[PDB]
């Protein structure tokens, strides 16, 4: 079908979000060259489950998701099915039967800034672990101790987002990674 | 499920050697399997990955140098490494996950390890 997936609008795209401010995008009806995005020198993470990449060359009749979004080098790990920590608990899970890629680069050039980047933020508290897919973007007072927030910080009541440093002298797997997420809609 | 490395030793500048990994209980159907260096004090850091598809994936700096491959028959992995130069002397790890194919040259992706051995290049 010729017309060519707009990947560049989800790849090259100069801001990123927050992790608990995931963004998804959608591709459809489109062809694409899987090998451009695969063999790009950038990307050190591109993994497949339960589809072979190929399957991104003909979008003729289908629909993707592509979720995006930044966090430090040593939480990829957890963007993947059956993974626990934090940023999987509390801000992007992924299924346990997840079909689809997941694939990372490490962004330093771009995301961090000599004083600190503190733009990019996590959510670090939740009472409950996320579903599949689900997105909060709540900014309510966590109440950690027994006494009441009534909406500010308190001695155990915490505001639940907190900022990652990216600092560029960072060790790796402090520093910022941008992930991109391919899955199918029906 | 468990992986042994062999094959490691002492080269001088632009020699070879070969490392392998024999599998023990590994019988994944679609996986990802990978070799991983760590200098003294340093990081692990991933040098080649080969899927079940075929699709190998190199780190920049030994691109054209290594060659990984593996053995469905004998559920063996090789690293054929040429052109050692100092800058190779590590830590040597054979590692293998479970469930998607790709690449990943992240050691923290991977489920499974190896015991290591010593490549050292004078």
């Known amino acids: 079908c010729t017309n060519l997936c707009p990947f560049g609008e989800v790849f090259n795209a100069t801001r990123f979000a927050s992790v608990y401010a995931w963004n998804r995008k959608r591709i459809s009806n489109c062809v694409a060259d899987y090998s451009v995005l695969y063999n790009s020198a950038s990307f050190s993470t591109f993994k497949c489950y339960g589809v072979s990449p190929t399957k991104l060359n003909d979008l003729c009749f289908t629909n993707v998701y592509a979720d995006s979004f930044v966090i430090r080098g040593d939480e990829v790990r957890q963007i993947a099915p059956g993974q626990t920590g934090k940023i999987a608990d509390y801000n992007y899970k992924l299924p346990d039967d997840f079909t689809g890629c997941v694939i990372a680069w490490n962004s330093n050039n771009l995301d961090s800034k000599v004083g600190g980047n503190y733009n990019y933020l996590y959510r670090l508290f939740r009472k409950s672990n996320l579903k599949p897919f689900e997105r909060d973007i709540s900014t309510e007072i966590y109440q950690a101790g027994s006494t009441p927030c009534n909406g500010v910080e308190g001695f155990n009541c915490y505001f639940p987002l907190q900022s990652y440093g990216f600092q560029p002298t960072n060790g790796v797997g402090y520093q910022p990674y941008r992930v991109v997420v391919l899955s199918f809609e029906l | 499920v468990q992986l042994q490395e062999s094959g490691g030793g002492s080269v001088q500048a632009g020699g070879s050697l070969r490392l392998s990994c024999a599998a023990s209980?590994?019988?994944?159907?679609?996986?990802?399997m990978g070799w991983f260096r760590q200098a003294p004090g340093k990081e692990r850091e991933g040098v080649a990955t080969?899927?079940?598809?075929?699709?190998?994936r190199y780190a920049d700096s030994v691109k054209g140098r290594f060659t990984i491959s593996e053995d469905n028959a004998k559920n063996t992995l090789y690293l054929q490494m040429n052109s050692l130069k100092p800058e190779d002397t590590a830590m040597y790890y054979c590692?293998?996950?479970?469930?998607?194919?790709?690449?990943?040259?992240?050691?923290?992706?991977?489920?499974?390890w190896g015991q290591g051995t010593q490549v050292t290049v004078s």
């Open positions: 590692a293998a996950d479970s469930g998607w194919v790709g690449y990943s040259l992240d050691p923290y992706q991977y489920n499974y």
């Open positions: 080969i899927d079940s598809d075929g699709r190998t």
């Open positions: 209980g590994y019988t994944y159907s679609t996986y990802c």
